[PDB]
Design a binder for this molecule. Structure first.
Ligand SMILES: *[C@@H]1O[C@H](CO)[C@@H](O[C@@H]2O[C@H](CO)[C@@H](O[C@@H]3O[C@H](CO)[C@@H](O)[C@H](O[C@H]4O[C@H](CO)[C@@H](O)[C@H](O)[C@@H]4O)[C@@H]3O)[C@H](O)[C@H]2NC(C)=O)[C@H](O)[C@H]1NC(C)=O
Ligand SMILES: *[C@@H]1O[C@H](CO)[C@@H](O[C@@H]2O[C@H](CO)[C@@H](O)[C@H](O)[C@H]2NC(C)=O)[C@H](O)[C@H]1NC(C)=O
Ligand SMILES: *[C@@H]1O[C@H](CO)[C@@H](O)[C@H](O)[C@H]1NC(C)=O
Lengths: 500, 47
C-alpha cells in the first residue's frame, strides 16, 4: 500500500524548456513515497512549487540535486537512500551547482529525516545560496566503508543564513527552526548496540534490521527495513517455504513461509514471473536452464544437455549500455527463440553511431529476428526500414510477457515508422503492460484488432493515436479483407487476418 | 555562468536534442525535444 514511482535516469539532461522539464518532473514524482530508481531534481526555476517532494520517503538508487534556481526543495521526509546505484560510480547523494547566474538560488534543503545511506558517499559543490548544510555531520548517516569517498566542499558566498537553533546537538541542522535539527542514530549509539539506535541508552539499541532507526527494539518497530520487509516486520532474509528439522534430519513445511519478490516477502509471485525451487520470484533463469509451466506455476528447470540458447536483451549482459539492436550486436541474436529481456530498435541503429563506434545497420540483417517467438520484457520499435511496409521480422512472434516495461508501463511500443500495416500475425498474448502505437503516419490496421483479447491482466490499456486516420484508410480502400470480419487483421491480405 | 554551447565534435550525440556544456562539472549533456527522455534523448516519452 506504499505509493511507488519509477524514478528517472536522465542525469542532468533537460526535457524541453524549463516548463516542460518541471511538468515531467512533477508528473513523475506526484504523491510518490518509494522511488525504485533515482530521484533527480534538476533545472527547477525560481518561484516553482515543489510541494509533491514532501511525500517521498525512500529512494532505492541515488539522489541528484543540480542546477536548480528554486529557493527551497522540501525533501522533508526523505528517510533513506539505499544506494543501489551510484551517481558517477561513488555517490548516492550529489547536490551540485544550485544557483542562477545572478548569484541566487537554492537555500533551503530541510532533509531533517535523512538518517541512513546504505551504500555510497555524498558530494556537495557550488551551492552558493545553500543554507545550513555545512553543519550536518555525515559520519552518522553514511556507512563507514564509504567515508573516504566523500568530496564535499561546503562553502557559501551568501552568508545570510539563520544559525542553527541552540537546541540542535553540536550545531548540526538542515534548516532553520528547532524542528530541522539532526537526529543521530549511529554515532551517539552505545557500545553494546548492534547497529542503529534511538539514544545512547542500551534500551534504545535498535534491531540490526532497522535501517533508519526504530521506535522500539522489536523487528516490527523499525523505521525502514535494511534487507527484506515481511508484512510489518524487517527480516534479514525471507522466511523459506520449508525449514530443516535438526531432530529428524528432514525438511518440514514452514507455515510462515514467503516468496522473495524484490525487497518484499509476498504470498505469491506475480502472474507473469518465474519461480525458482528456492521459493523466489525471478525475472529469468540462469544459463542451461529453461522456463516451463507445470501445475499453474511458471518455474525454472535444469536441462541435462539440449535446451535453448541464452539470449539476453538490449540492456542486460553483453548489451550493458547499448541503446539499440545495431550492426555490432545483431549477430549475437542469430538463433534466438526467447529474448530474456527487452528489445530496442532506435533510429541510430540505421544511421550508425560514431560515439559508440557503431556502423550503420543493414535492414536485410533484421530478418535474423524472424526466429523469435517469445519476448519476456518489452518490445520498443522507434525505427524500421523505410522501404518495408510491415514489421516483417516479427511475423512469428507470439507472446510478449512484459516482465520489465518501458518507463515501467509499456510492453509494446511502435512509434514513428513509415510502415503501413503492423503485420504481427502470430501475436497471441501480451501478458502485462500497455501498448502505444503513435506517430506512424501510414499505419492503417491497428484499429481493427481487439487488443483486449491479447491482454493477460485487467487494466492493460492501449494508446492508438496519430497514425493514418481511420477514415483516411477507409477512403483509400486500405481496410481488412472481406473474408476476415470478426476480429480485424494486421494487413490487407487474407493471411494477415486474425480469424479469417 | 552555468551552461554553454557544445563543440562541433558533438553532432549526433543528442538523438533528439541540443548539446549543452556544463562548466561546473566539465561535462556534456543534452536538452531534449518535448516528449523525449534519456541522457541522450533517445526514447519517446509517454506524453
Ligand atoms: C551498439 O551495440 C554495442 C554492443 O552492445 C554497444 O556497445 C557497447 O557500448 C557501451 C557504451 O559505450 C559499452 O559500455 C561501456 O563499458 C565501459 C567498460 O568497458 C564503461 O567504462 C562505459 O562507461 C562507464 O563509465 C561511465 C563514466 O562516466 C559511466 O557514465 C557509464 O554509465 C559506465 O558506468 C560503458 O559502460 C559496452 O562495452 C559496449 N559493448 C560492446 C560489445 O561494444 C553500443 O553502445 C551500441 N550502440 C549504441 C548507440 O548504444
Ligand atoms: C572509493 O572507495 C574505493 C574502495 O575503497 C577506493 O577505490 C580504490 O581503487 C579501486 C577502484 O575502486 C579499488 O579496487 C581499490 O580497492 C580501492 N582502494 C585502493 C587502495 O586502491 C577509493 O577509496 C574510492 N574510489 C575512487 C574512484 O575515489
Ligand atoms: C514510405 O512508404 C510509402 C508507401 O508507399 C512509400 O511511397 C515511401 O517511399 C516510403 N518512404 C521511403 C523513404 O521509402
Amino acid at each position: 500500500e506504499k505509493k511507488v514511482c519509477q524514478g528517472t535516469s536522465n542525469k542532468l539532461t533537460q526535457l524541453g524548456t524549463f516548463e516542460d522539464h518541471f511538468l515531467s518532473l512533477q508528473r513523475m514524482f506526484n504523491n510518490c513515497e518509494v522511488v525504485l530508481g533515482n530521484l533527480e531534481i534538476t533545472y527547477v526555476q525560481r518561484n516553482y512549487d515543489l510541494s509533491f517532494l514532501k511525500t517521498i520517503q525512500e529512494v532505492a538508487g541515488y539522489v541528484l540535486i543540480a542546477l536548480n534556481t528554486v529557493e527551497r526543495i522540501p525533501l522533508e521526509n526523505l528517510q533513506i537512500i539505499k544506494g543501489n546505484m551510484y551517481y558517477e560510480n561513488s555517490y548516492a547523494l550529489a547536490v551540485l551547482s544550485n544557483y542562477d547566474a545572478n548569484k541566487t538560488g537554492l537555500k533551503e534543503l530541510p532533509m531533517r529525516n535523512l538518517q541512513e545511506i546504505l551504500h555510497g558517499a555524498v558530494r556537495f559543490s557550488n551551492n552558493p545560496a545553500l543554507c545550513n548544510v555545512e553543519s550536518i555531520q555525515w559520519r552518522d548517516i553514511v556507512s563507514s566503508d564509504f567515508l573516504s569517498n566523500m568530496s564535499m566542499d561546503f562553502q557559501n558566498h551568501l552568508g545570510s543564513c539563520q544559525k542553527c537553533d541552540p537546541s540542535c546537538p553540536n550545531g548540526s541542522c538542515w534548516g532553520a527552526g528547532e524542528e530541522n535539527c539532526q537526529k543521530l542514530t549511529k554515532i551517539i549509539c552505545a557500545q553494546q548496540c548492534s547497529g542503529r539506535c534511538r539514544g545512547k541508552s542500551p534500551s534504545d539499541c535498535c534491531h540490526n534490521q532497522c535501517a533508519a532507526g526504530c521506535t522500539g527494539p522489536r523487528e516490527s518497530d523499525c523505521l525502514v527495513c535494511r534487507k527484506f520487509r515481511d508484512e510489518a516486520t524487517c527480516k534479514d532474509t525471507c522466511p523459506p517455504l520449508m525449514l530443516y528439522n535438526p531432530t529428524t534430519y528432514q525438511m518440514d513445511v514452514n507455515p510462515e513461509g514467503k516468496y522473495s519478490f524484490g525487497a518484499t516477502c509476498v504470498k505469491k509471485c506475480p502472474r507473469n514471473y518465474v519461480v525458482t525451487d528456492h521459493g523466489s520470484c525471478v525475472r529469468a533463469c540462469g544459463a542451461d536452464s529453461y522456463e516451463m509451466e507445470e501445475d499453474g506455476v511458471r518455474k525454472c528447470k535444469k536441462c541435462e544437455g539440449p535446451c535453448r540458447k541464452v539470449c539476453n536483451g538490449i540492456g542486460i549482459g553483453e548489451f550493458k549500455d547499448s541503446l539499440s539492436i545495431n550492426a555490432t550486436n545483431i549477430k549475437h541474436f542469430k538463433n534466438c527463440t526467447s529474448i530474456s529481456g527487452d528489445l530496442h530498435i532506435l533510429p541510430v541503429a540505421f544511421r550508425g553511431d560514431s560515439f559508440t563506434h557503431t556502423p550503420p545497420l543493414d535492414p536485410q540483417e533484421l530478418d535474423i529476428l524472424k526466429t523469435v517467438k517469445e519476448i519476456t520484457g518489452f518490445l520498443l520499435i522507434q525505427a524500421w526500414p523505410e522501404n518495408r511496409t510491415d514489421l516483417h521480422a516479427f511475423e512469428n512472434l507470439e507472446i510478449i510477457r512484459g516482465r520489465t516495461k518501458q518507463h515501467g508501463q509499456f510492453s509494446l511500443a511502435v512509434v514513428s515508422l513509415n510502415i503501413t500495416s503492423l503485420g504481427l500475425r502470430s501475436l497471441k498474448e501480451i501478458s502485462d503492460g500497455d501498448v502505444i502505437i503513435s506517430g506512424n503516419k501510414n499505419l492503417c490496421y491497428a484499429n481493427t484488432i481487439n487488443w483486449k483479447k491479447l491482454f493477460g491482466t485487467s487494466g492493460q490499456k492501449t494508446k492508438i493515436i496519430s497514425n493514418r486516420g481511420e477514415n483516411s484508410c477507409k477512403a483509400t480502400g486500405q481496410v481488412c479483407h472481406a473474408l476476415c470480419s470478426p476480429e480485424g487483421c494486421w494487413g490487407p491480405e487474407p493471411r494477415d487476418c486474425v480469424s479469417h | 555562468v552555468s551552461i554553454t554551447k557544445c563543440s562541433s565534435d558533438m553532432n549526433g550525440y543528442c538523438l533528439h536534442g541540443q548539446c549543452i556544456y556544463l562548466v561546473d562539472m566539465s561535462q556534456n549533456y543534452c536538452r531534449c525535444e518535448v516528449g523525449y527522455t534519456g541522457v541522450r534523448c533517445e526514447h519517446f516519452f509517454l506524453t
